[PDB]
Ligand binder design. Structure first.
Ligand SMILES: Cc1noc(C)c1-c1ccc(CNS(=O)(=O)c2c(C)nn(C)c2Cl)cc1
Length: 250
């Protein structure tokens, strides 16, 4: 049967989040980007709410909690996108929200299309690996815990205990299906290498975000208030490499 912590993770998953996209009039790049930003503002709230129910997290110093969220928001959102796209449309469209699903036709702008192809590697890997919901839920928590400041965290001990606990839980998740030590271990390698590889992908999304943000008035792209602050607070420092990404492999 399903381990308790995984059952809890399932129960604290956010409910479906709508973009609120005006689905009548057609896409310009800038209107589509505004909708994505509006959706991202709703997803950020939902990430912050989720984190308050996530076992272990609230017990870290409040500054660590804020930092871990500001560092991981993009990863969490690309990972969420991959899962939904995998689950709902067999990884063959980008399922941002039920009212915002993008197929190839709706990605005109080449820079944005390039970005979408990059994000698309995640749903493709989920399909290839056949990631279970149980593995995903533990992987997601490890993403929240996958980048820390160069100095480390105020609650460094508690943080490392928490990360360890979700790594064991992922190994439990893997065991639900993957029987046998060699298959289990190869599977662990694969899923944690996927997490390692997300740092690279996410760096491209970070740069595109800060660019679009600085140029927002020239592009007519709207950035809501909470998103604007996470970007202003941390994105230049993150892009400048002034953070320590955690890696499962050398
Ligand atoms: C929402 C959502 N779901 O997955 C992703 C990725 C998002 C998302 C994440 C971040 C942002 C911030 N603005 S943005 O740079 O213009 C951007 C990024 C980064 N990705 N996308 C799809 C956009 Cl628009 C907007 C949407």
């Amino acid at each position: 049967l399903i381990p308790p912590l995984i059952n809890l993770l399932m129960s604290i998953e956010p409910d479906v989040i709508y973009a609120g996209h005006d689905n009548t009039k057609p896409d310009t790049s800038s209107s589509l980007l505004t909708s994505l930003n509006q959706l991202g503002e709703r997803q950020l709230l939902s990430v912050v709410k989720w984190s308050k129910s996530l076992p272990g997290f609230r017990n870290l110093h409040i500054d660590d909690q804020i930092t871990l969220i500001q560092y991981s928001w993009m990863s969490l959102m690309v990972f969420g996108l991959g899962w939904r796209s995998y689950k709902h449309v067999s990884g063959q469209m980008l399922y941002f929200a039920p009212d915002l699903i993008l197929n190839e036709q709706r990605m005109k702008e080449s820079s944005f299309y390039s970005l979408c192809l990059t994000m698309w590697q995640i749903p493709q890997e989920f399909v290839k690996l056949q990631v279970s919901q149980e593995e995903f839920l533990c992987m997601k928590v490890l993403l929240l815990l996958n980048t820390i400041p160069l100095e480390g965290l105020r609650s460094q001990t508690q943080f490392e205990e928490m990360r360890s606990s979700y790594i064991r839980e992922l190994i439990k998740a893997i065991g639900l299906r993957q029987k046998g030590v060699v298959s289990s271990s190869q599977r662990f390698y694969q899923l944690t290498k996927l997490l390692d590889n997300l740092h690279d992908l996410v760096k491209q999304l970070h740069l595109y975000c800060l660019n679009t943000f600085i140029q927002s008035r020239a592009l007519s792209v709207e950035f809501p208030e909470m998103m604007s602050e996470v970007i202003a607070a941390q994105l230049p420092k993150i892009l400048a490499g002034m953070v320590k990404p955690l890696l499962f492999h050398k």
